[PDB]
Design an enzyme around this catalytic site. Structure first.
Site, short mmCIF file in Angstrom:
data_model
loop_
_atom_site.label_atom_id
_atom_site.label_comp_id
_atom_site.label_asym_id
_atom_site.label_seq_id
_atom_site.Cartn_x
_atom_site.Cartn_y
_atom_site.Cartn_z
N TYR A 37 50.08 54.74 4.56
CA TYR A 37 49.82 55.35 5.87
C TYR A 37 51.08 55.51 6.70
O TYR A 37 51.07 56.20 7.71
CB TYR A 37 48.78 54.59 6.68
CG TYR A 37 47.42 54.42 5.98
CD1 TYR A 37 47.08 55.17 4.87
CD2 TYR A 37 46.51 53.49 6.47
CE1 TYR A 37 45.86 55.00 4.24
CE2 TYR A 37 45.28 53.31 5.83
CZ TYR A 37 44.99 54.06 4.73
OH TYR A 37 43.76 53.85 4.09
N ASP A 62 42.32 47.83 9.32
CA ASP A 62 42.51 48.36 7.98
C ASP A 62 43.79 49.17 7.92
O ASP A 62 43.92 50.18 8.63
CB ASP A 62 41.34 49.23 7.55
CG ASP A 62 41.51 49.67 6.10
OD1 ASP A 62 41.26 48.85 5.20
OD2 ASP A 62 41.93 50.84 5.88
N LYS A 97 46.79 47.48 1.42
CA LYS A 97 46.50 48.05 0.12
C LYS A 97 47.77 48.34 -0.63
O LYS A 97 48.75 48.86 -0.06
CB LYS A 97 45.68 49.32 0.23
CG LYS A 97 44.55 49.27 1.25
CD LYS A 97 43.62 50.44 1.23
CE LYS A 97 42.68 50.49 2.42
NZ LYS A 97 43.37 50.93 3.66
N1 LIG Z 1 40.67 53.20 0.72
C1 LIG Z 1 40.87 54.52 0.84
O1 LIG Z 1 41.17 55.24 -0.12
C2 LIG Z 1 40.64 55.10 2.19
C3 LIG Z 1 40.40 56.49 2.28
C4 LIG Z 1 40.10 57.04 3.53
C5 LIG Z 1 40.02 56.24 4.64
N2 LIG Z 1 40.33 54.87 4.55
C6 LIG Z 1 40.34 53.99 5.74
O2 LIG Z 1 39.18 54.28 6.49
C7 LIG Z 1 39.56 54.68 7.84
C8 LIG Z 1 38.52 55.58 8.43
O3 LIG Z 1 38.42 56.83 7.67
P1 LIG Z 1 39.17 58.18 8.12
O4 LIG Z 1 40.37 57.86 8.93
O5 LIG Z 1 39.31 58.97 6.88
O6 LIG Z 1 38.10 58.95 9.04
P2 LIG Z 1 36.92 58.60 10.06
O7 LIG Z 1 37.08 57.23 10.58
O8 LIG Z 1 35.68 59.02 9.36
O9 LIG Z 1 37.20 59.71 11.17
C9 LIG Z 1 38.42 59.61 11.98
C10 LIG Z 1 38.46 60.86 12.83
O10 LIG Z 1 37.36 60.85 13.76
C11 LIG Z 1 37.87 61.00 15.09
N3 LIG Z 1 37.02 60.18 15.94
C12 LIG Z 1 37.03 58.82 15.99
N4 LIG Z 1 36.13 58.32 16.83
C13 LIG Z 1 35.53 59.43 17.35
C14 LIG Z 1 34.52 59.53 18.32
N5 LIG Z 1 33.96 58.49 18.93
N6 LIG Z 1 34.16 60.83 18.65
C15 LIG Z 1 34.73 61.86 18.05
N7 LIG Z 1 35.70 61.85 17.13
C16 LIG Z 1 36.08 60.58 16.81
C17 LIG Z 1 39.31 60.60 15.01
O11 LIG Z 1 40.05 61.22 16.05
P3 LIG Z 1 41.21 60.48 16.93
O12 LIG Z 1 41.83 59.42 16.08
O13 LIG Z 1 42.12 61.64 17.26
O14 LIG Z 1 40.50 59.91 18.12
C18 LIG Z 1 39.74 61.05 13.64
O15 LIG Z 1 40.09 62.42 13.62
C19 LIG Z 1 40.95 55.23 7.61
O16 LIG Z 1 41.69 55.42 8.83
C20 LIG Z 1 41.56 54.23 6.64
O17 LIG Z 1 41.86 53.05 7.41
C21 LIG Z 1 40.62 54.32 3.33
O1 LIG Z 2 43.87 56.40 1.81
C1 LIG Z 2 43.49 56.89 2.86
O2 LIG Z 2 43.08 56.22 3.89
C2 LIG Z 2 43.28 58.42 2.95
O3 LIG Z 2 43.93 59.18 1.92
C3 LIG Z 2 45.28 59.39 1.96
C4 LIG Z 2 46.15 58.65 2.74
C5 LIG Z 2 47.47 58.92 2.77
F1 LIG Z 2 48.26 58.19 3.56
C6 LIG Z 2 48.02 59.93 2.01
C7 LIG Z 2 47.16 60.66 1.19
C8 LIG Z 2 45.79 60.40 1.13
C9 LIG Z 2 45.01 61.21 0.17
O4 LIG Z 2 45.48 62.25 -0.32
N1 LIG Z 2 43.80 60.73 -0.21
C10 LIG Z 2 43.03 61.44 -1.24
C11 LIG Z 2 43.28 60.84 -2.59
N2 LIG Z 2 42.58 61.13 -3.64
C12 LIG Z 2 43.09 60.45 -4.72
C13 LIG Z 2 42.54 60.43 -6.02
F2 LIG Z 2 41.48 61.21 -6.28
C14 LIG Z 2 43.12 59.64 -6.98
F3 LIG Z 2 42.55 59.62 -8.20
C15 LIG Z 2 44.23 58.83 -6.74
C16 LIG Z 2 44.77 58.88 -5.48
F4 LIG Z 2 45.83 58.12 -5.18
C17 LIG Z 2 44.21 59.65 -4.47
S1 LIG Z 2 44.61 59.75 -2.81
#
Ligand SMILES: NC(=O)c1ccc[n+]([C@@H]2O[C@H](COP(=O)([O-])OP(=O)(O)OC[C@H]3O[C@@H](n4cnc5c(N)ncnc54)[C@H](OP(=O)(O)O)[C@@H]3O)[C@@H](O)[C@H]2O)c1
Ligand SMILES: O=C(O)COc1cc(F)ccc1C(=O)NCc1nc2c(F)c(F)cc(F)c2s1
Length: 316
Positions: free
Chosen positions: A49, A44, A78
């Protein structure tokens, strides 16, 4: 468990993928290499990012090694908010493809329903800290996404952070060409998303759970905030299975028929997080984890709350 889920385009999406937000450029190449070695076949990504080149470095090589075939990989990216104008979408996709060193994406998502003023800044703010919107709408952006499928740049399109009314807007379009394949949303025991998941699943849209570990590294996290990984109740469920809390948190959405994308850059954790196919959460465990819901959302920004398309004013 089966390991992939069928999408509307006939493709199969691995239910476990590697997240890459906050995987630093200088560390993410090794992360992705290790992930592919240990079995991940879904990554993903996103333009915002700021690390797609380095992810691409890793992928291309594991091709150069003959470790995996491109058809085996499921690469997601994305469209960022500053590129919602119909005339900017293709270039944004092509920039991602060039950075990733790929000729197609398996899935391309509208990252948020909110369009922001185009420009260099990812988060254009006014002098008072409010995000500056663009004069874009969901349906026109979706039409531009559909053209990417018809040009062969992406195999499937979807959405992220859309509420059910925003999903419905797309579904109800008379001239709809492609239904969204996926809605990627925050989901974990403190934000269990029962109504939105029910809605999406009833519409044949696959749900991907992001931040399944609670995104402890998110930059706006406050010391008082709840912590999934440290929750002693989840630790106790994990201990019963001689698994880690992270492994429980990853298995949980899988058993809800969701895709899940935990992030790590730490090799030892990348490998641990994949070892979730050798146990099952009991029905009691599942019920217990669901009971931890607090409607507690970590991924949102105050600066975006006045955008017309801000998704989280609706109940779901
Ligand atoms: N579509 C969107 O708007 C959106 C928003 C948020 C997230 N995402 C996607 O979803 C992915 C996952 O969400 P996230 O990155 O927000 O957080 P997450 O996967 O919930 O948590 C990641 C964190 O947990 C730590 N971690 C990972 N595995 C671990 C384990 N086995 N034990 C302890 N700590 C651990 C990582 O540390 P280290 O990396 O330092 O090991 C990092 O600080 C993102 O990276 C992104 O690809 C998308
Ligand atoms: O995307 C990721 O994996 C993790 O998130 C992020 C990832 C990045 F690389 C930079 C910022 C964010 C971040 O600030 N995220 C929080 C958001 N909230 C909002 C929101 F409420 C909106 F209505 C519109 C918007 F665009 C955002 S972005």
């Amino acid at each position: 468990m089966a390991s992939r889920i069928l999408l509307n385009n006939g493709a199969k999406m691995p239910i476990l993928g590697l997240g890459t937000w906050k995987s630093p450029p200088g560390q993410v190449t090794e992360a992705v290499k290790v992930a592919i070695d240990v079995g991940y076949r879904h990554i993903d990504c996103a333009h915002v990012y700021q690390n797609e080149n380095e992810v691409g470095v890793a992928i291309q090589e594991k091709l150069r090694e003959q470790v995996v075939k491109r058809e085996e990989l499921f690469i997601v990216s994305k469209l960022w908010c500053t590129y919602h104008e119909k005339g900017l979408v293709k270039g944004a996709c092509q920039k991602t493809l060039s950075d990733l060193k790929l000729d197609y994406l398996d899935l391309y998502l509208i990252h948020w329903p909110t369009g922001f003023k185009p420009g260099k800044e990812f988060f254009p703010l006014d002098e008072s800290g409010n995000v500056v919107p663009s004069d874009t709408n969901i349906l026109d952006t979706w039409a531009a996404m559909e053209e990417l499928v018809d040009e062969g740049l992406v195999k499937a399109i979807g959405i992220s952070n859309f509420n059910h009314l925003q999903v419905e807007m797309i579904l109800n379009k008379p001239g709809l060409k492609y239904k969204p394949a996926v809605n990627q949303i925050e989901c974990h025991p403190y934000l269990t998303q029962e109504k939105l998941i029910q809605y999406c699943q009833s519409k044949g849209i696959v749900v991907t759970a992001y931040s399944p570990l609670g995104s402890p590294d998110r930059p706006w996290a406050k010391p008082e905030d709840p912590s999934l990984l440290e929750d002693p109740r989840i630790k106790a469920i994990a201990a019963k299975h001689n698994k880690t809390t992270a492994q429980v948190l990853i298995r949980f959405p899988m058993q809800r028929n969701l895709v899940v994308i935990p992030k790590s850059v730490t090799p030892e954790r990348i490998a641990e997080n994949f070892k979730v196919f050798d146990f099952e959460l009991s029905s009691q465990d599942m019920t217990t984890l669901l009971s931890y819901n607090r409607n507690w959302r970590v991924c949102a920004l105050l600066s975006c709350t006045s955008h017309k398309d801000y998704p989280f004013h609706e109940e779901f």
